[PDB]
Amino acid sequence: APDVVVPTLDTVRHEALLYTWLAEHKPLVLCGPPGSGKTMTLFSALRALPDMEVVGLNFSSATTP
Amino acid sequence: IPRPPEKYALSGHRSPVTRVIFHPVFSVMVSASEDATIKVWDYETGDFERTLKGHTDSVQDISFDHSGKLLASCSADMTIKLWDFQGFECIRTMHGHDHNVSSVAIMPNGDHIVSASRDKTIKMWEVQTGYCVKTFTGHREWVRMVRPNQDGTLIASCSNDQTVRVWVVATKECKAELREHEHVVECISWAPESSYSSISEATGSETKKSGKPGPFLLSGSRDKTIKMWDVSTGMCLMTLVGHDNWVRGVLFHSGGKFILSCADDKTLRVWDYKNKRCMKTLNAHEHFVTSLDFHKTAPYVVTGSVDQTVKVWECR
Amino acid sequence: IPRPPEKYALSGHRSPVTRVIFHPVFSVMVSASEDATIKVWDYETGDFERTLKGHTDSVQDISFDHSGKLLASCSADMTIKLWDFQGFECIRTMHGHDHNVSSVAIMPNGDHIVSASRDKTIKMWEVQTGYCVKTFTGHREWVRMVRPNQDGTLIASCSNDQTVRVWVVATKECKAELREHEHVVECISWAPESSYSSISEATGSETKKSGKPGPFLLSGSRDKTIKMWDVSTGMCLMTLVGHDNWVRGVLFHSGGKFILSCADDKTLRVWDYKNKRCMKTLNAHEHFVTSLDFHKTAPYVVTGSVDQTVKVWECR
Amino acid sequence: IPSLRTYAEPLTAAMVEFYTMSQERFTQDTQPHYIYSPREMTRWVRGIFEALRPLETLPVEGLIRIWAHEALRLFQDRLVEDEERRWTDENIDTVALKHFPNIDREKAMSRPILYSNWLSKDYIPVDQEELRDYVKARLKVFYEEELDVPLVLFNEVLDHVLRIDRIFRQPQGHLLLIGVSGAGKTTLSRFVAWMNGLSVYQIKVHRKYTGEDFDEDLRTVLRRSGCKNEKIAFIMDESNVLDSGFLERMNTLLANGEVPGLFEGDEYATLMTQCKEGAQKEGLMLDSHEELYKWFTSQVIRNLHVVFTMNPSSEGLKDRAATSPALFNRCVLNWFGDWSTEALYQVGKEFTSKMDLEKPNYIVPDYMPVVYDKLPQPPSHREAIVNSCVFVHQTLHQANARLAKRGGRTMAITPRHYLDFINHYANLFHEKRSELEEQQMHLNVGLRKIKETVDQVEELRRKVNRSTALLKSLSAERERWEKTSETFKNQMSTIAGDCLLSAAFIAYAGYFDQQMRQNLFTTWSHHLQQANIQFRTDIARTEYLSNADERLRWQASSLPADDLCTENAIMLKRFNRYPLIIDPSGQATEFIMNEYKDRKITRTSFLDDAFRKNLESALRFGNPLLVQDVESYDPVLNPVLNREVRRTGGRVLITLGDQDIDLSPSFVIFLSTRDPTVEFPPDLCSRVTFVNFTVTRSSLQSQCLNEVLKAERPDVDEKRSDLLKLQGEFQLRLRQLEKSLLQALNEVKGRILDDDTIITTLENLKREAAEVTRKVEETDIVMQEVETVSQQYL
Numbered sequence A: 001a002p003d004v005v006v007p008t009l010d011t012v013r014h015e016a017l018l019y020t021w022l023a024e025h026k027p028l029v030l031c032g033p034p035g036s037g038k039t040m041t042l043f044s045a046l047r048a049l050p051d052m053e054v055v056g057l058n059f060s061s062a063t064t065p
Numbered sequence B, C: 001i002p003r004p005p006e007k008y009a010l011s012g013h014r015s016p017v018t019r020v021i022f023h024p025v026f027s028v029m030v031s032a033s034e035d036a037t038i039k040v041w042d043y044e045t046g047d048f049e050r051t052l053k054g055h056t057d058s059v060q061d062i063s064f065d066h067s068g069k070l071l072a073s074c075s076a077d078m079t080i081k082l083w084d085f086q087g088f089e090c091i092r093t094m095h096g097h098d099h100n101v102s103s104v105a106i107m108p109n110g111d112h113i114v115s116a117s118r119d120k121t122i123k124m125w126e127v128q129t130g131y132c133v134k135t136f137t138g139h140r141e142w143v144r145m146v147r148p149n150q151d152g153t154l155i156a157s158c159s160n161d162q163t164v165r166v167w168v169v170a171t172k173e174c175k176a177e178l179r180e181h182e183h184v185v186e187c188i189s190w191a192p193e194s195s196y197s198s199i200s201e202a203t204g205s206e207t208k209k210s211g212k213p214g215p216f217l218l219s220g221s222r223d224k225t226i227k228m229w230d231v232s233t234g235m236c237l238m239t240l241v242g243h244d245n246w247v248r249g250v251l252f253h254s255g256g257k258f259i260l261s262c263a264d265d266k267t268l269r270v271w272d273y274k275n276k277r278c279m280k281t282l283n284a285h286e287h288f289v290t291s292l293d294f295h296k297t298a299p300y301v302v303t304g305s306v307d308q309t310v311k312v313w314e315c316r
Numbered sequence D: 001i002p003s004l005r006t007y008a009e010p011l012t013a014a015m016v017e018f019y020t021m022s023q024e025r026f027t028q029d030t031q032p033h034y035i036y037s038p039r040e041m042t043r044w045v046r047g048i049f050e051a052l053r054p055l056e057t058l059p060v061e062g063l064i065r066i067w068a069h070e071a072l073r074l075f076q077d078r079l080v081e082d083e084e085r086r087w088t089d090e091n092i093d094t095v096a097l098k099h100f101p102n103i104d105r106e107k108a109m110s111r112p113i114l115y116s117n118w119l120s121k122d123y124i125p126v127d128q129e130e131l132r133d134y135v136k137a138r139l140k141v142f143y144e145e146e147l148d149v150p151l152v153l154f155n156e157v158l159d160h161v162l163r164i165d166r167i168f169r170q171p172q173g174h175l176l177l178i179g180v181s182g183a184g185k186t187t188l189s190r191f192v193a194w195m196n197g198l199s200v201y202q203i204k205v206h207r208k209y210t211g212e213d214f215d216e217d218l219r220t221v222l223r224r225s226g227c228k229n230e231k232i233a234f235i236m237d238e239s240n241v242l243d244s245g246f247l248e249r250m251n252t253l254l255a256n257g258e259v260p261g262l263f264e265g266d267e268y269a270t271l272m273t274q275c276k277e278g279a280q281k282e283g284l285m286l287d288s289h290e291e292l293y294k295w296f297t298s299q300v301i302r303n304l305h306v307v308f309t310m311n312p313s314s315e316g317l318k319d320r321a322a323t324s325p326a327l328f329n330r331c332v333l334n335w336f337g338d339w340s341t342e343a344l345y346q347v348g349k350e351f352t353s354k355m356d357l358e359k360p361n362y363i364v365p366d367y368m369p370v371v372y373d374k375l376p377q378p379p380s381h382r383e384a385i386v387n388s389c390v391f392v393h394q395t396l397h398q399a400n401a402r403l404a405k406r407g408g409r410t411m412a413i414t415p416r417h418y419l420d421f422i423n424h425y426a427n428l429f430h431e432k433r434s435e436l437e438e439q440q441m442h443l444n445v446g447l448r449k450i451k452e453t454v455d456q457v458e459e460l461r462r463k464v465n466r467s468t469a470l471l472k473s474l475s476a477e478r479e480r481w482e483k484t485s486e487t488f489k490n491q492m493s494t495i496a497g498d499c500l501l502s503a504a505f506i507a508y509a510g511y512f513d514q515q516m517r518q519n520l521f522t523t524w525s526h527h528l529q530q531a532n533i534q535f536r537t538d539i540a541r542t543e544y545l546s547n548a549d550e551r552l553r554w555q556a557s558s559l560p561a562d563d564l565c566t567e568n569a570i571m572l573k574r575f576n577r578y579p580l581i582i583d584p585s586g587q588a589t590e591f592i593m594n595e596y597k598d599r600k601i602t603r604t605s606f607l608d609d610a611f612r613k614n615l616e617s618a619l620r621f622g623n624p625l626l627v628q629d630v631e632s633y634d635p636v637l638n639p640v641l642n643r644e645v646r647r648t649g650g651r652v653l654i655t656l657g658d659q660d661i662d663l664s665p666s667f668v669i670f671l672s673t674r675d676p677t678v679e680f681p682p683d684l685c686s687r688v689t690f691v692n693f694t695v696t697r698s699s700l701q702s703q704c705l706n707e708v709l710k711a712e713r714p715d716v717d718e719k720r721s722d723l724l725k726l727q728g729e730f731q732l733r734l735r736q737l738e739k740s741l742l743q744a745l746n747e748v749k750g751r752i753l754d755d756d757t758i759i760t761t762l763e764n765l766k767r768e769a770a771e772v773t774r775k776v777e778e779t780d781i782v783m784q785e786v787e788t789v790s791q792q793y794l
């Protein structure tokens, strides 16, 4: 399902790092090949924070502010 | 309940059969095809009796009045023809539908006709003259079938908009809009009064103040499921599953104990709704089965098909 | 039995009509004439349906199959045309078979056909490919009519040598050579099983060990006599006289109780063979009558004639 | 299934094994869409699980089969070429056998690994033939429903319709079909969408179409989907996008499931009200703005499927990925490609299942050029004719490549061209066969009447002088009548190859110049001679296609008297898709204008604002329409060009833009332009036949000679013109009297004793002898003198 992930070493490490950076309210970036698991790790880190709500945004090559 | 030994296989049509019905009195059966021919057979002896030409394109539906003296047919040429069955003549013709008419039915009062067409509306005609008197509108797509209730004070129409609308004849108001199917609704059928109480037993529906359980209705669709609705409340009492293709016809057993249906899975299925006891299956035809009908009194069933043959099964 | 009043007299052909047949399943009649055209009529309402002008020269004989989907036709162009009664166009035109092909027939197996011509032979073709595999020889002159038995294991051929031969399909031997007519034999016809037992008391034929009365055949000739023949014994069972000219067609009533004949006497004659009670004669046409046919189920008969008019009659 | 638990640990490994291979073989270095991520393994497990949900009991064989089917639906579709596909199939079977040594290979690994939920109520395997029969019947119903345009059902169609049905059954199912235009992507999508109850909705792109129009279209589709819930098959085409704004709007709609800010101001409030009403109808009680917005977004995600159809353009894949990653991330990619030789062979046989191609004496050659991979090596005549048909279609591709390598623009070859070629072949076969058979019938009956006349005169001889005179005069023609009757069999023998070559010429070589047309025809003839296919050589295509009767009308209708112009007129006469005239000079324009002048042909242009009205008038009146300035093509013509008619019990009905109008059977439309070097939109490339009115060297040489003889020697030019017209009139009369002789001879059913027949035959023989006298004298004494004057100026 979209809302499930088997806890693996990489997942728990990256989720902890993202939680550390997000609790500090510091903007950040995840650079990896498509399908690596960047979005799922982000949502797993975010759901730990209960006062934290996300808004999606998709960037094309013809986007403006 | 019909069983696998078919009694007769009547094959005279040159095109797929669309509708087959029983004359309410005489021991004679009628089948409409896509070759514009209303061929009239005899089911007791398995003998052709006489054809009825007159329409220009495929006949989509046929119906008899309460006395059986009149046969109203609707064709794909946007024409509804009335037939003096005693004389086998077309005494009147009616036009007015933008696209082909795909349904027809006579009010039990015997003084009006209703028809449904691809022009997304239902028309009502008077028998004495042939002039349209009412026009039910509100469907957003092709209306496949219209069938009034027993006393004629309500009608029900299914359409390609995946909804079934129950209309009031007196004031044209849309009494109900039953929409839970996931595909095009192909066929509907009212519940005979004799089954009313039995219905309340199967679904456990509770009675209201007046004591009338509320008229019930069946809807078959291309979603391979047959739903059953309570008009008085507008809620889906139950769903029936098991067909392997689009349901084409569905009807109640005269005893109010089984539901007969035919689909494009080449099977006639007899289902049980009270105890879910019987789920009998019949390999009715070698191709799609377009329509069925159960005689009110005599223990016979007829099914049309796309393989250009009609079949008669005996009930035992 | 056919009676005085002709129901319809359909006149569309430009040349003398040769042979008229019924479609096995549909309410459709087919006629072949000398104008190299095959016309399609609706004998129920006397309507024109279609004409097929694919042939080169005059069409002699036409024949359907059991299912009524294919129609094999023969013409004086030394070709046999396989017509698809579904697409109404030629799917195969088998060549060869020298000279005017007089007759063509589809065996009940429905996979092979037989053809007879002026070239003193009878060729059998496959529907699938159209390649000649067996070619029966032994007739000394023009072979006119050929019709297999109802199970496809035997064929019969009449010829201008005034001899009628019964051939075995499987191994190419002359099972019987009945040569007793006084003039050229024009028409032959097999007997249905429903009348075999009748033949038993009609001619006093005795049963063999197997109990079967034996395969029966008929032959009408220019000698004004119709002979009925026992294929098993090769004997002349009974000869029937009374026609004023050459007999052109002879066949059995579907009930196995009367014999129908059309001859050059411009009249069609219904005779009784078991008891010789009936000898009815009706003035069929103002000119020669070329062929006759009886509908298997409908009480309708059709007669073709040289006057380019096809007359249909009802049975009562 | 508490019987395959032990198979949990092998299955996983197998998947991973196979998955790893797909990462180390199909790199993005080859095509931009060859990216395989754990997301593929996620949708793999999801597909296997969904295929196992309703089913009760299943052996290991069924599990392996489902696993292989899913891997083929995830790793066999995005592939572009067949070599990679064969590699994928080999390795899928190999890994399945490796990870399950004790398995029944045939039961699990059959070749047509198909699954459907149409035949049954549960997703289960289906045999190919039953699926073909069922889809044939359903397509017969679909025709009456929409799109009366017929479709052939070959193996590929079935695979693609199954894939698209799979995708439409998913909640947020976005599909991206990459295949050559006309291959059937749109019609297959509409067919399967109708099967699934989806209300197909496509944007009506036009010349004015701008960002605001597309935003309104998105508002319409979203309002229909979210509120007033109804499934929608929103079909977009790579040409229907004009601005990058369309691409970014589709990107956000696909990815997010809802475009933000589309409903602004009043639209926001109206949508909020409609969503509230829909929630009350459904039963949910919502009042807050964001709750209703989230409900609407969920409904849109659930009940809106977008099908993007795009052309396989190299270096356009990477650009399209860059400008909109959603197409390559939130859309499953189905590579339709171009019809394989197998597909072309199947459609050829299916349409030429009515033709009388059987030839029992067809001698199989020592060498046969095999084009179809599964061609039976002892093939019958039909299996060689269809083989040569697919060879011709493959020859067009080589010709296009040769023109591209050394030359200018090449027009793309599409399966619609093959469909037109086959339709032309069938129609031409029926017409030529009917004409030859009727001619032979008339000749035979006339010769029989002549034999009866001979009987008459001989039995009178055993009032006579006239009989013998007419006998001799008529035998002077009977000699050639008997020659023609004898050669009837030969002409019938070679009617197959000739119709094939003529159809291939009038269906394919409509764009090329004279040299390329001749080269293509020569190659086709060489191949047919290799396959021992009978065809009457030494007969010009233009004479065979068109008789002199209509050639006289064309030449009198201001058409140059040359081979190329005659062929172009032939193409204008026999056409399935409406023509497109590409002429530098305007000659074809007045040619068409005069030819259809009697029908009240109207002149209109795309640029003209009344173009719609005139068009509508034609659509309701059935009068011919000629449209110029095709460069600014108006896509509202797309339905009428594809004949998207709808039978209404006798009336064919066509939708233009958004308004629906009845069609008249007498309606014919022509398209033209004056720019030989111009590029047309890709959607119009495959919707219309092309006829190129180029200048031939011989055609120009004739024009120069005619003009120089008009100026230098007006007297000789006048003689030339009056003799040429006089000769044409003699040929017209020759055909008239000759045909009337036969018609009268057939009509009489008596004998020579008739008073009219004798006088008619004597006057006819006298008249034709006198006409021959003038013909021979003018071709001897006056044409030779004219030739000498033109010879010195040549």
Ligand SMILES: Nc1ncnc2c1ncn2[C@@H]1O[C@H](COP(=O)(O)OP(=O)(O)O)[C@@H](O)[C@H]1O
Pocket: A004, A005, A006, A007, A008, A011, A032, A033, A034, A035, A036, A037, A038, A039, A040, A041, D037, D038, D039, D040, D042, D043
């Ligand atoms: N540990 C995991 N558990 C579950 N799913 C996983 C795991 N790792 C990868 N996936 C799958 O891989 C895909 C990654 O999707 P997403 O997070 O959007 O990737 P990215 O952001 O890298 O493009 C999803 O299908 C996800 O379910």
Ligand SMILES: Nc1ncnc2c1ncn2[C@@H]1O[C@H](COP(=O)(O)OP(=O)(O)O)[C@@H](O)[C@H]1O
Pocket: D149, D150, D151, D152, D153, D157, D180, D181, D182, D183, D184, D185, D186, D187, D188, D309, D416, D419, D642
């Ligand atoms: N398999 C097919 N058999 C017959 N006609 C086909 C087939 N595929 C496409 N066509 C024809 O092509 C046209 C539809 O093309 P369309 O699907 O709109 O093009 P595209 O492939 O660019 O999406 C119609 O004329 C249709 O009948």
